[PDB]
Amino acid sequence: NLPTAQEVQGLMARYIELVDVGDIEAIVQMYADDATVEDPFGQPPIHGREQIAAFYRQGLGGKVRACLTGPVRASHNGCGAMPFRVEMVANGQPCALDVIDVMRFDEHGRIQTMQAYWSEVNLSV
Amino acid sequence: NLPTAQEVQGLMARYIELVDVGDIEAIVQMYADDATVEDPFGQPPIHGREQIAAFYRQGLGGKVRACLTGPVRASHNGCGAMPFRVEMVANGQPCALDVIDVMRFDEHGRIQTMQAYWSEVNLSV
Ligand SMILES: C[C@]12CCc3c(ccc4cc(O)ccc34)[C@@H]1CCC2=O
Ligand SMILES: C[C@]12CCc3c(ccc4cc(O)ccc34)[C@@H]1CCC2=O
């Protein structure tokens, strides 16, 4: 909760930068050591930087680009939400996915929890 | 959870239509009889259609316009999130607010919970 609303926007916007360039290790470092990731929201949670790193590597190493599609909405309790689009190549087929992540940051300015909202109704070829 | 992902997008997009025209009674009817609203997220929850109606009337009757700024992100468990902008007139001063609502729908296709993410860093004159 330590991050102010402006710090949240900055942090979350940097995250999207990292996913865009694919700096997996830099992304894992933004998360708390024991953070949880629910992506897509509804699935079972992923816990810990090791698992998170595996998750991101499995999804980024290949091909994948991402960018904010609107400003970052931030609350005053270290929480935030942002809209963005991901463009990837699915086994030859060019694809895009519109997503919204809700993140809760801890007192050290690290991501404690992340939830990504999307399903195939958000996929587009 | 009854609503499919496509039904979620439709429902949430209709909600924004209702806020745009200001049909308060129609908006209250989209919510479950005992739904809770947290707006801005972080504040104490509002419970029940009576309180919800008061909330919406206090905020809409005046002046206020709203519209989706991106597609609706929907999961498969009756949950959804959408980005939108609200344009209002603050005591003479024209203003806009970028928001993201996360909604959970119940088995009857009604909104059980709504959380709006935003703060003054999202306000713009
Ligand atoms: C893995 C993936 C690329 C990146 C990505 C996806 C879904 C949600 C995400 C949420 C994030 O916060 C960062 C990256 C992704 C896609 C699912 C299908 C795909 O190719
Ligand atoms: C009340 C309000 C107009 C409508 C509105 C606001 C904030 C969050 C919202 C979330 C909604 O899902 C629907 C409408 C609003 C503004 C706060 C300042 C203002 O003028």
Side-chain angles (χ1 to χ4, degrees), chain A residues 3-62 64-92 94-125, chain B residues 3-62 64-92 94-125:
Chain A
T4 59
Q6 295 180 186
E7 303 188 302
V8 173
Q9 309 192 91
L11 280 162
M12 292 185 72
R14 171 162 174 258
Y15 168 87
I16 294 290
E17 283 175 54
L18 296 181
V19 176
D20 185 59
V21 291
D23 197 332
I24 299 167
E25 271 165 39
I27 296 172
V28 175
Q29 226 41 48
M30 284 195 79
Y31 284 93
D33 63 281
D34 62 342
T36 64
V37 171
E38 298 173 71
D39 181 8
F41 183 72
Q43 283 301 76
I46 308 171
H47 320 70
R49 286 181 173 163
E50 174 176 42
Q51 293 179 54
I52 297 188
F55 178 66
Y56 277 100
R57 192 164 289 289
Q58 182 74 285
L60 262 38
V64 178
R65 298 300 292 183
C67 73
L68 284 179
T69 54
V72 174
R73 279 66 168 185
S75 292
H76 294 307
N77 49 349
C79 283
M82 64 183 149
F84 59 106
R85 168 161 287 197
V86 183
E87 288 186 352
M88 73 285 213
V89 185
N91 311 302
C95 296
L97 205 221
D98 296 301
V99 191
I100 277 181
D101 282 341
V102 164
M103 295 183 167
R104 173 170 282 187
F105 291 81
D106 71 357
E107 57 301 308
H108 304 85
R110 305 198 185 79
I111 310 174
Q112 187 69 62
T113 73
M114 180 280 258
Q115 301 166 304
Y117 290 70
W118 64 273
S119 69
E120 69 291 328
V121 293
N122 293 122
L123 293 175
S124 57
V125 194
Chain B
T4 59
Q6 295 180 186
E7 303 188 302
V8 173
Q9 309 192 91
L11 280 162
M12 292 185 72
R14 171 162 174 258
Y15 168 87
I16 294 290
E17 283 175 54
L18 296 181
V19 176
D20 185 59
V21 291
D23 197 332
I24 299 167
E25 271 165 39
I27 296 172
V28 175
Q29 226 41 48
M30 284 195 79
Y31 284 93
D33 63 281
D34 62 342
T36 64
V37 171
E38 298 173 71
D39 181 8
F41 183 72
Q43 283 301 76
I46 308 171
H47 320 70
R49 286 181 173 163
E50 174 176 42
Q51 293 179 54
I52 297 188
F55 178 66
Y56 277 100
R57 192 164 289 289
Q58 182 74 285
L60 262 38
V64 178
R65 298 300 292 183
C67 73
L68 284 179
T69 54
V72 174
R73 279 66 168 185
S75 292
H76 294 307
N77 49 349
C79 283
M82 64 183 149
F84 59 106
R85 168 161 287 197
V86 183
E87 288 186 352
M88 73 285 213
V89 185
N91 311 302
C95 296
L97 205 221
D98 296 301
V99 191
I100 277 181
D101 282 341
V102 164
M103 295 183 167
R104 173 170 282 187
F105 291 81
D106 71 357
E107 57 301 308
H108 304 85
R110 305 198 185 79
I111 310 174
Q112 187 69 62
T113 73
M114 180 280 258
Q115 301 166 304
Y117 290 70
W118 64 273
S119 69
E120 69 291 328
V121 293
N122 293 122
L123 293 175
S124 57
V125 194

PDB file of all heavy atoms in Angstrom, chain A residues 40-77, unseen atoms left out:
ATOM      1  N   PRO A  40      -5.471 -16.845 -16.708  1.00  0.00           N
ATOM      2  CA  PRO A  40      -6.595 -15.904 -16.624  1.00  0.00           C
ATOM      3  C   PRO A  40      -7.269 -15.990 -15.265  1.00  0.00           C
ATOM      4  O   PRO A  40      -7.236 -17.040 -14.624  1.00  0.00           O
ATOM      5  CB  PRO A  40      -7.548 -16.381 -17.723  1.00  0.00           C
ATOM      6  CG  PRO A  40      -6.711 -17.269 -18.596  1.00  0.00           C
ATOM      7  CD  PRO A  40      -5.781 -17.942 -17.635  1.00  0.00           C
ATOM      8  N   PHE A  41      -7.888 -14.901 -14.825  1.00  0.00           N
ATOM      9  CA  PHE A  41      -8.572 -14.936 -13.546  1.00  0.00           C
ATOM     10  C   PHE A  41      -9.630 -16.018 -13.664  1.00  0.00           C
ATOM     11  O   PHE A  41     -10.410 -16.033 -14.619  1.00  0.00           O
ATOM     12  CB  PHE A  41      -9.253 -13.610 -13.229  1.00  0.00           C
ATOM     13  CG  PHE A  41      -9.905 -13.591 -11.876  1.00  0.00           C
ATOM     14  CD1 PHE A  41      -9.132 -13.544 -10.722  1.00  0.00           C
ATOM     15  CD2 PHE A  41     -11.291 -13.660 -11.754  1.00  0.00           C
ATOM     16  CE1 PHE A  41      -9.723 -13.568  -9.461  1.00  0.00           C
ATOM     17  CE2 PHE A  41     -11.895 -13.685 -10.502  1.00  0.00           C
ATOM     18  CZ  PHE A  41     -11.110 -13.639  -9.348  1.00  0.00           C
ATOM     19  N   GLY A  42      -9.646 -16.915 -12.685  1.00  0.00           N
ATOM     20  CA  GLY A  42     -10.585 -18.019 -12.691  1.00  0.00           C
ATOM     21  C   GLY A  42      -9.797 -19.309 -12.559  1.00  0.00           C
ATOM     22  O   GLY A  42     -10.269 -20.296 -11.994  1.00  0.00           O
ATOM     23  N   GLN A  43      -8.576 -19.288 -13.081  1.00  0.00           N
ATOM     24  CA  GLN A  43      -7.694 -20.442 -13.024  1.00  0.00           C
ATOM     25  C   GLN A  43      -7.058 -20.542 -11.645  1.00  0.00           C
ATOM     26  O   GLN A  43      -7.220 -19.654 -10.811  1.00  0.00           O
ATOM     27  CB  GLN A  43      -6.593 -20.312 -14.078  1.00  0.00           C
ATOM     28  CG  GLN A  43      -7.035 -20.622 -15.496  1.00  0.00           C
ATOM     29  CD  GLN A  43      -7.587 -22.027 -15.629  1.00  0.00           C
ATOM     30  OE1 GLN A  43      -8.718 -22.302 -15.224  1.00  0.00           O
ATOM     31  NE2 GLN A  43      -6.785 -22.933 -16.188  1.00  0.00           N
ATOM     32  N   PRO A  44      -6.335 -21.638 -11.379  1.00  0.00           N
ATOM     33  CA  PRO A  44      -5.696 -21.772 -10.067  1.00  0.00           C
ATOM     34  C   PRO A  44      -4.537 -20.781  -9.987  1.00  0.00           C
ATOM     35  O   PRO A  44      -3.883 -20.492 -10.994  1.00  0.00           O
ATOM     36  CB  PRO A  44      -5.226 -23.221 -10.063  1.00  0.00           C
ATOM     37  CG  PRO A  44      -4.884 -23.455 -11.516  1.00  0.00           C
ATOM     38  CD  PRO A  44      -6.068 -22.818 -12.220  1.00  0.00           C
ATOM     39  N   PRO A  45      -4.276 -20.239  -8.790  1.00  0.00           N
ATOM     40  CA  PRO A  45      -3.189 -19.277  -8.597  1.00  0.00           C
ATOM     41  C   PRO A  45      -1.791 -19.879  -8.720  1.00  0.00           C
ATOM     42  O   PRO A  45      -1.576 -21.063  -8.445  1.00  0.00           O
ATOM     43  CB  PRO A  45      -3.442 -18.742  -7.186  1.00  0.00           C
ATOM     44  CG  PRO A  45      -4.923 -18.964  -6.984  1.00  0.00           C
ATOM     45  CD  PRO A  45      -5.122 -20.320  -7.587  1.00  0.00           C
ATOM     46  N   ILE A  46      -0.850 -19.036  -9.132  1.00  0.00           N
ATOM     47  CA  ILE A  46       0.555 -19.404  -9.270  1.00  0.00           C
ATOM     48  C   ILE A  46       1.217 -18.691  -8.092  1.00  0.00           C
ATOM     49  O   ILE A  46       0.914 -17.524  -7.839  1.00  0.00           O
ATOM     50  CB  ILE A  46       1.135 -18.849 -10.583  1.00  0.00           C
ATOM     51  CG1 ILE A  46       0.237 -19.251 -11.758  1.00  0.00           C
ATOM     52  CG2 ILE A  46       2.534 -19.377 -10.798  1.00  0.00           C
ATOM     53  CD1 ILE A  46       0.591 -18.566 -13.073  1.00  0.00           C
ATOM     54  N   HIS A  47       2.101 -19.372  -7.364  1.00  0.00           N
ATOM     55  CA  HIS A  47       2.751 -18.743  -6.217  1.00  0.00           C
ATOM     56  C   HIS A  47       4.274 -18.791  -6.262  1.00  0.00           C
ATOM     57  O   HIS A  47       4.866 -19.810  -6.620  1.00  0.00           O
ATOM     58  CB  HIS A  47       2.324 -19.405  -4.900  1.00  0.00           C
ATOM     59  CG  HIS A  47       0.876 -19.769  -4.832  1.00  0.00           C
ATOM     60  ND1 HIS A  47       0.331 -20.789  -5.581  1.00  0.00           N
ATOM     61  CD2 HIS A  47      -0.129 -19.286  -4.062  1.00  0.00           C
ATOM     62  CE1 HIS A  47      -0.948 -20.921  -5.273  1.00  0.00           C
ATOM     63  NE2 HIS A  47      -1.251 -20.022  -4.354  1.00  0.00           N
ATOM     64  N   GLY A  48       4.900 -17.691  -5.859  1.00  0.00           N
ATOM     65  CA  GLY A  48       6.350 -17.633  -5.825  1.00  0.00           C
ATOM     66  C   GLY A  48       7.020 -17.235  -7.119  1.00  0.00           C
ATOM     67  O   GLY A  48       6.555 -17.579  -8.208  1.00  0.00           O
ATOM     68  N   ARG A  49       8.132 -16.519  -6.989  1.00  0.00           N
ATOM     69  CA  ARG A  49       8.893 -16.051  -8.140  1.00  0.00           C
ATOM     70  C   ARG A  49       9.345 -17.169  -9.061  1.00  0.00           C
ATOM     71  O   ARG A  49       9.405 -16.974 -10.273  1.00  0.00           O
ATOM     72  CB  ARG A  49      10.110 -15.240  -7.683  1.00  0.00           C
ATOM     73  CG  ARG A  49       9.756 -13.859  -7.176  1.00  0.00           C
ATOM     74  CD  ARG A  49      10.983 -13.104  -6.762  1.00  0.00           C
ATOM     75  NE  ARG A  49      10.693 -11.712  -6.426  1.00  0.00           N
ATOM     76  CZ  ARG A  49      11.516 -10.936  -5.729  1.00  0.00           C
ATOM     77  NH1 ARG A  49      12.672 -11.425  -5.302  1.00  0.00           N
ATOM     78  NH2 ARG A  49      11.192  -9.677  -5.459  1.00  0.00           N
ATOM     79  N   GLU A  50       9.666 -18.336  -8.509  1.00  0.00           N
ATOM     80  CA  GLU A  50      10.093 -19.432  -9.365  1.00  0.00           C
ATOM     81  C   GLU A  50       8.962 -19.763 -10.326  1.00  0.00           C
ATOM     82  O   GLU A  50       9.137 -19.703 -11.541  1.00  0.00           O
ATOM     83  CB  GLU A  50      10.469 -20.685  -8.556  1.00  0.00           C
ATOM     84  CG  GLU A  50      10.782 -21.895  -9.454  1.00  0.00           C
ATOM     85  CD  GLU A  50      11.256 -23.127  -8.693  1.00  0.00           C
ATOM     86  OE1 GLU A  50      10.684 -23.447  -7.628  1.00  0.00           O
ATOM     87  OE2 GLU A  50      12.197 -23.793  -9.172  1.00  0.00           O
ATOM     88  N   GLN A  51       7.795 -20.093  -9.788  1.00  0.00           N
ATOM     89  CA  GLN A  51       6.654 -20.414 -10.640  1.00  0.00           C
ATOM     90  C   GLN A  51       6.284 -19.253 -11.566  1.00  0.00           C
ATOM     91  O   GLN A  51       5.994 -19.459 -12.741  1.00  0.00           O
ATOM     92  CB  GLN A  51       5.454 -20.802  -9.780  1.00  0.00           C
ATOM     93  CG  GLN A  51       5.639 -22.118  -9.027  1.00  0.00           C
ATOM     94  CD  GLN A  51       4.447 -22.463  -8.157  1.00  0.00           C
ATOM     95  OE1 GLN A  51       3.314 -22.515  -8.632  1.00  0.00           O
ATOM     96  NE2 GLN A  51       4.697 -22.703  -6.874  1.00  0.00           N
ATOM     97  N   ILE A  52       6.305 -18.030 -11.045  1.00  0.00           N
ATOM     98  CA  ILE A  52       5.965 -16.861 -11.855  1.00  0.00           C
ATOM     99  C   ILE A  52       6.927 -16.761 -13.042  1.00  0.00           C
ATOM    100  O   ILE A  52       6.507 -16.574 -14.187  1.00  0.00           O
ATOM    101  CB  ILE A  52       6.000 -15.560 -10.993  1.00  0.00           C
ATOM    102  CG1 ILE A  52       4.926 -15.647  -9.899  1.00  0.00           C
ATOM    103  CG2 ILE A  52       5.754 -14.325 -11.860  1.00  0.00           C
ATOM    104  CD1 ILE A  52       4.721 -14.366  -9.103  1.00  0.00           C
ATOM    105  N   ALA A  53       8.218 -16.910 -12.772  1.00  0.00           N
ATOM    106  CA  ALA A  53       9.221 -16.854 -13.831  1.00  0.00           C
ATOM    107  C   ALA A  53       8.933 -17.907 -14.896  1.00  0.00           C
ATOM    108  O   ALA A  53       9.037 -17.639 -16.097  1.00  0.00           O
ATOM    109  CB  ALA A  53      10.605 -17.083 -13.249  1.00  0.00           C
ATOM    110  N   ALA A  54       8.591 -19.116 -14.462  1.00  0.00           N
ATOM    111  CA  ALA A  54       8.300 -20.184 -15.420  1.00  0.00           C
ATOM    112  C   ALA A  54       7.123 -19.750 -16.271  1.00  0.00           C
ATOM    113  O   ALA A  54       7.142 -19.866 -17.499  1.00  0.00           O
ATOM    114  CB  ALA A  54       7.965 -21.485 -14.690  1.00  0.00           C
ATOM    115  N   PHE A  55       6.095 -19.246 -15.605  1.00  0.00           N
ATOM    116  CA  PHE A  55       4.908 -18.780 -16.298  1.00  0.00           C
ATOM    117  C   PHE A  55       5.274 -17.771 -17.387  1.00  0.00           C
ATOM    118  O   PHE A  55       4.937 -17.954 -18.554  1.00  0.00           O
ATOM    119  CB  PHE A  55       3.943 -18.127 -15.303  1.00  0.00           C
ATOM    120  CG  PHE A  55       2.700 -17.581 -15.940  1.00  0.00           C
ATOM    121  CD1 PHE A  55       1.770 -18.437 -16.526  1.00  0.00           C
ATOM    122  CD2 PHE A  55       2.465 -16.209 -15.970  1.00  0.00           C
ATOM    123  CE1 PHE A  55       0.619 -17.934 -17.132  1.00  0.00           C
ATOM    124  CE2 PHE A  55       1.319 -15.695 -16.574  1.00  0.00           C
ATOM    125  CZ  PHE A  55       0.395 -16.559 -17.155  1.00  0.00           C
ATOM    126  N   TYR A  56       5.961 -16.701 -16.999  1.00  0.00           N
ATOM    127  CA  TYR A  56       6.346 -15.668 -17.950  1.00  0.00           C
ATOM    128  C   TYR A  56       7.277 -16.161 -19.045  1.00  0.00           C
ATOM    129  O   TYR A  56       7.123 -15.784 -20.209  1.00  0.00           O
ATOM    130  CB  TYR A  56       6.982 -14.481 -17.221  1.00  0.00           C
ATOM    131  CG  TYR A  56       5.965 -13.516 -16.667  1.00  0.00           C
ATOM    132  CD1 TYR A  56       5.606 -13.554 -15.321  1.00  0.00           C
ATOM    133  CD2 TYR A  56       5.322 -12.600 -17.495  1.00  0.00           C
ATOM    134  CE1 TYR A  56       4.622 -12.705 -14.808  1.00  0.00           C
ATOM    135  CE2 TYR A  56       4.334 -11.737 -16.991  1.00  0.00           C
ATOM    136  CZ  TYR A  56       3.987 -11.801 -15.648  1.00  0.00           C
ATOM    137  OH  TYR A  56       2.986 -11.002 -15.141  1.00  0.00           O
ATOM    138  N   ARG A  57       8.240 -17.004 -18.692  1.00  0.00           N
ATOM    139  CA  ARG A  57       9.150 -17.499 -19.713  1.00  0.00           C
ATOM    140  C   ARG A  57       8.360 -18.315 -20.732  1.00  0.00           C
ATOM    141  O   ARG A  57       8.500 -18.120 -21.940  1.00  0.00           O
ATOM    142  CB  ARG A  57      10.273 -18.341 -19.092  1.00  0.00           C
ATOM    143  CG  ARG A  57      11.414 -18.634 -20.060  1.00  0.00           C
ATOM    144  CD  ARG A  57      12.671 -19.112 -19.337  1.00  0.00           C
ATOM    145  NE  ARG A  57      13.345 -18.053 -18.581  1.00  0.00           N
ATOM    146  CZ  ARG A  57      14.013 -17.040 -19.128  1.00  0.00           C
ATOM    147  NH1 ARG A  57      14.102 -16.934 -20.451  1.00  0.00           N
ATOM    148  NH2 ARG A  57      14.618 -16.142 -18.352  1.00  0.00           N
ATOM    149  N   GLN A  58       7.513 -19.212 -20.238  1.00  0.00           N
ATOM    150  CA  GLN A  58       6.692 -20.050 -21.107  1.00  0.00           C
ATOM    151  C   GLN A  58       5.828 -19.188 -22.042  1.00  0.00           C
ATOM    152  O   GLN A  58       5.522 -19.582 -23.163  1.00  0.00           O
ATOM    153  CB  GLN A  58       5.803 -20.954 -20.243  1.00  0.00           C
ATOM    154  CG  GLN A  58       4.910 -21.935 -20.997  1.00  0.00           C
ATOM    155  CD  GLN A  58       5.670 -23.119 -21.581  1.00  0.00           C
ATOM    156  OE1 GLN A  58       6.377 -22.991 -22.583  1.00  0.00           O
ATOM    157  NE2 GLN A  58       5.530 -24.280 -20.948  1.00  0.00           N
ATOM    158  N   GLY A  59       5.452 -17.997 -21.588  1.00  0.00           N
ATOM    159  CA  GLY A  59       4.617 -17.152 -22.420  1.00  0.00           C
ATOM    160  C   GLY A  59       5.303 -16.062 -23.227  1.00  0.00           C
ATOM    161  O   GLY A  59       4.715 -15.561 -24.184  1.00  0.00           O
ATOM    162  N   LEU A  60       6.536 -15.703 -22.878  1.00  0.00           N
ATOM    163  CA  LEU A  60       7.237 -14.627 -23.583  1.00  0.00           C
ATOM    164  C   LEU A  60       8.371 -15.016 -24.537  1.00  0.00           C
ATOM    165  O   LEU A  60       8.505 -14.427 -25.609  1.00  0.00           O
ATOM    166  CB  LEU A  60       7.752 -13.607 -22.556  1.00  0.00           C
ATOM    167  CG  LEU A  60       6.888 -12.355 -22.346  1.00  0.00           C
ATOM    168  CD1 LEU A  60       5.417 -12.718 -22.399  1.00  0.00           C
ATOM    169  CD2 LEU A  60       7.236 -11.692 -21.022  1.00  0.00           C
ATOM    170  N   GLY A  61       9.183 -15.995 -24.154  1.00  0.00           N
ATOM    171  CA  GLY A  61      10.300 -16.427 -24.993  1.00  0.00           C
ATOM    172  C   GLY A  61       9.845 -17.072 -26.302  1.00  0.00           C
ATOM    173  O   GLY A  61       9.384 -18.212 -26.312  1.00  0.00           O
ATOM    174  N   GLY A  62       9.982 -16.343 -27.407  1.00  0.00           N
ATOM    175  CA  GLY A  62       9.587 -16.858 -28.715  1.00  0.00           C
ATOM    176  C   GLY A  62       9.992 -15.895 -29.824  1.00  0.00           C
ATOM    177  O   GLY A  62      10.311 -14.732 -29.562  1.00  0.00           O
ATOM    178  N   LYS A  63       8.364 -12.205 -30.521  1.00  0.00           N
ATOM    179  CA  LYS A  63       7.113 -12.875 -30.852  1.00  0.00           C
ATOM    180  C   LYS A  63       5.924 -12.233 -30.141  1.00  0.00           C
ATOM    181  O   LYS A  63       4.811 -12.215 -30.666  1.00  0.00           O
ATOM    182  CB  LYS A  63       7.201 -14.349 -30.481  1.00  0.00           C
ATOM    183  N   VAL A  64       6.161 -11.708 -28.944  1.00  0.00           N
ATOM    184  CA  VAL A  64       5.093 -11.081 -28.171  1.00  0.00           C
ATOM    185  C   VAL A  64       5.341  -9.602 -27.908  1.00  0.00           C
ATOM    186  O   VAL A  64       6.422  -9.212 -27.471  1.00  0.00           O
ATOM    187  CB  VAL A  64       4.902 -11.783 -26.810  1.00  0.00           C
ATOM    188  CG1 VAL A  64       3.817 -11.072 -26.005  1.00  0.00           C
ATOM    189  CG2 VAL A  64       4.541 -13.250 -27.026  1.00  0.00           C
ATOM    190  N   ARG A  65       4.323  -8.789 -28.179  1.00  0.00           N
ATOM    191  CA  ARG A  65       4.390  -7.345 -27.962  1.00  0.00           C
ATOM    192  C   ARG A  65       3.188  -6.917 -27.132  1.00  0.00           C
ATOM    193  O   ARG A  65       2.131  -7.547 -27.187  1.00  0.00           O
ATOM    194  CB  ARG A  65       4.390  -6.601 -29.300  1.00  0.00           C
ATOM    195  CG  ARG A  65       5.588  -6.925 -30.175  1.00  0.00           C
ATOM    196  CD  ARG A  65       6.906  -6.566 -29.492  1.00  0.00           C
ATOM    197  NE  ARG A  65       7.076  -5.121 -29.332  1.00  0.00           N
ATOM    198  CZ  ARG A  65       8.162  -4.545 -28.815  1.00  0.00           C
ATOM    199  NH1 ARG A  65       9.182  -5.288 -28.400  1.00  0.00           N
ATOM    200  NH2 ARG A  65       8.236  -3.223 -28.727  1.00  0.00           N
ATOM    201  N   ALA A  66       3.342  -5.841 -26.368  1.00  0.00           N
ATOM    202  CA  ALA A  66       2.256  -5.377 -25.522  1.00  0.00           C
ATOM    203  C   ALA A  66       2.312  -3.881 -25.295  1.00  0.00           C
ATOM    204  O   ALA A  66       3.381  -3.281 -25.350  1.00  0.00           O
ATOM    205  CB  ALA A  66       2.300  -6.110 -24.192  1.00  0.00           C
ATOM    206  N   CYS A  67       1.154  -3.281 -25.035  1.00  0.00           N
ATOM    207  CA  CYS A  67       1.089  -1.848 -24.799  1.00  0.00           C
ATOM    208  C   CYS A  67      -0.203  -1.414 -24.111  1.00  0.00           C
ATOM    209  O   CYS A  67      -1.256  -2.038 -24.281  1.00  0.00           O
ATOM    210  CB  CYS A  67       1.202  -1.100 -26.121  1.00  0.00           C
ATOM    211  SG  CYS A  67      -0.289  -1.244 -27.098  1.00  0.00           S
ATOM    212  N   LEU A  68      -0.117  -0.341 -23.328  1.00  0.00           N
ATOM    213  CA  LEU A  68      -1.290   0.192 -22.662  1.00  0.00           C
ATOM    214  C   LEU A  68      -2.251   0.682 -23.732  1.00  0.00           C
ATOM    215  O   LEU A  68      -1.828   1.193 -24.775  1.00  0.00           O
ATOM    216  CB  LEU A  68      -0.915   1.365 -21.761  1.00  0.00           C
ATOM    217  CG  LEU A  68      -0.242   1.035 -20.437  1.00  0.00           C
ATOM    218  CD1 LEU A  68       0.072   2.325 -19.699  1.00  0.00           C
ATOM    219  CD2 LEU A  68      -1.159   0.152 -19.613  1.00  0.00           C
ATOM    220  N   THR A  69      -3.542   0.513 -23.480  1.00  0.00           N
ATOM    221  CA  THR A  69      -4.566   0.950 -24.418  1.00  0.00           C
ATOM    222  C   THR A  69      -5.402   2.033 -23.755  1.00  0.00           C
ATOM    223  O   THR A  69      -6.374   2.524 -24.319  1.00  0.00           O
ATOM    224  CB  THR A  69      -5.477  -0.218 -24.841  1.00  0.00           C
ATOM    225  OG1 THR A  69      -6.016  -0.860 -23.679  1.00  0.00           O
ATOM    226  CG2 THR A  69      -4.692  -1.230 -25.654  1.00  0.00           C
ATOM    227  N   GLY A  70      -4.998   2.401 -22.545  1.00  0.00           N
ATOM    228  CA  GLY A  70      -5.688   3.433 -21.798  1.00  0.00           C
ATOM    229  C   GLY A  70      -4.847   3.780 -20.588  1.00  0.00           C
ATOM    230  O   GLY A  70      -3.878   3.085 -20.301  1.00  0.00           O
ATOM    231  N   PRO A  71      -5.169   4.855 -19.862  1.00  0.00           N
ATOM    232  CA  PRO A  71      -4.353   5.180 -18.689  1.00  0.00           C
ATOM    233  C   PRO A  71      -4.532   4.166 -17.558  1.00  0.00           C
ATOM    234  O   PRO A  71      -5.475   3.375 -17.556  1.00  0.00           O
ATOM    235  CB  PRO A  71      -4.841   6.578 -18.312  1.00  0.00           C
ATOM    236  CG  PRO A  71      -6.284   6.548 -18.733  1.00  0.00           C
ATOM    237  CD  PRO A  71      -6.217   5.866 -20.082  1.00  0.00           C
ATOM    238  N   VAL A  72      -3.619   4.185 -16.599  1.00  0.00           N
ATOM    239  CA  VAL A  72      -3.702   3.276 -15.472  1.00  0.00           C
ATOM    240  C   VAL A  72      -4.616   3.865 -14.402  1.00  0.00           C
ATOM    241  O   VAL A  72      -4.449   5.008 -13.998  1.00  0.00           O
ATOM    242  CB  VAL A  72      -2.312   3.026 -14.853  1.00  0.00           C
ATOM    243  CG1 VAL A  72      -2.443   2.192 -13.592  1.00  0.00           C
ATOM    244  CG2 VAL A  72      -1.422   2.313 -15.855  1.00  0.00           C
ATOM    245  N   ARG A  73      -5.596   3.083 -13.966  1.00  0.00           N
ATOM    246  CA  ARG A  73      -6.514   3.522 -12.926  1.00  0.00           C
ATOM    247  C   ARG A  73      -5.900   3.070 -11.608  1.00  0.00           C
ATOM    248  O   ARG A  73      -5.634   1.883 -11.421  1.00  0.00           O
ATOM    249  CB  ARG A  73      -7.886   2.868 -13.106  1.00  0.00           C
ATOM    250  CG  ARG A  73      -8.786   3.523 -14.133  1.00  0.00           C
ATOM    251  CD  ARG A  73      -8.280   3.420 -15.564  1.00  0.00           C
ATOM    252  NE  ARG A  73      -9.352   3.813 -16.475  1.00  0.00           N
ATOM    253  CZ  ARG A  73      -9.300   3.751 -17.802  1.00  0.00           C
ATOM    254  NH1 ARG A  73      -8.212   3.311 -18.418  1.00  0.00           N
ATOM    255  NH2 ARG A  73     -10.362   4.108 -18.510  1.00  0.00           N
ATOM    256  N   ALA A  74      -5.668   4.011 -10.700  1.00  0.00           N
ATOM    257  CA  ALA A  74      -5.070   3.678  -9.417  1.00  0.00           C
ATOM    258  C   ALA A  74      -5.879   4.191  -8.234  1.00  0.00           C
ATOM    259  O   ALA A  74      -6.443   5.287  -8.277  1.00  0.00           O
ATOM    260  CB  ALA A  74      -3.654   4.223  -9.353  1.00  0.00           C
ATOM    261  N   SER A  75      -5.940   3.380  -7.183  1.00  0.00           N
ATOM    262  CA  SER A  75      -6.655   3.751  -5.974  1.00  0.00           C
ATOM    263  C   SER A  75      -5.631   4.279  -4.984  1.00  0.00           C
ATOM    264  O   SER A  75      -4.468   4.477  -5.331  1.00  0.00           O
ATOM    265  CB  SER A  75      -7.388   2.544  -5.388  1.00  0.00           C
ATOM    266  OG  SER A  75      -8.445   2.136  -6.246  1.00  0.00           O
ATOM    267  N   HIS A  76      -6.048   4.502  -3.747  1.00  0.00           N
ATOM    268  CA  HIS A  76      -5.127   5.026  -2.761  1.00  0.00           C
ATOM    269  C   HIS A  76      -4.633   3.996  -1.763  1.00  0.00           C
ATOM    270  O   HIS A  76      -3.948   4.335  -0.794  1.00  0.00           O
ATOM    271  CB  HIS A  76      -5.768   6.205  -2.035  1.00  0.00           C
ATOM    272  CG  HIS A  76      -6.000   7.387  -2.921  1.00  0.00           C
ATOM    273  ND1 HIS A  76      -4.996   7.951  -3.678  1.00  0.00           N
ATOM    274  CD2 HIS A  76      -7.118   8.105  -3.180  1.00  0.00           C
ATOM    275  CE1 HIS A  76      -5.486   8.967  -4.366  1.00  0.00           C
ATOM    276  NE2 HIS A  76      -6.772   9.082  -4.083  1.00  0.00           N
ATOM    277  N   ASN A  77      -4.962   2.736  -2.007  1.00  0.00           N
ATOM    278  CA  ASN A  77      -4.543   1.680  -1.103  1.00  0.00           C
ATOM    279  C   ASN A  77      -3.530   0.742  -1.753  1.00  0.00           C
ATOM    280  O   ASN A  77      -3.449  -0.436  -1.415  1.00  0.00           O
ATOM    281  CB  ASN A  77      -5.773   0.913  -0.595  1.00  0.00           C
ATOM    282  CG  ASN A  77      -6.718   0.499  -1.715  1.00  0.00           C
ATOM    283  OD1 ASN A  77      -6.589   0.945  -2.858  1.00  0.00           O
ATOM    284  ND2 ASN A  77      -7.683  -0.357  -1.383  1.00  0.00           N
TER     285      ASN A  77
END
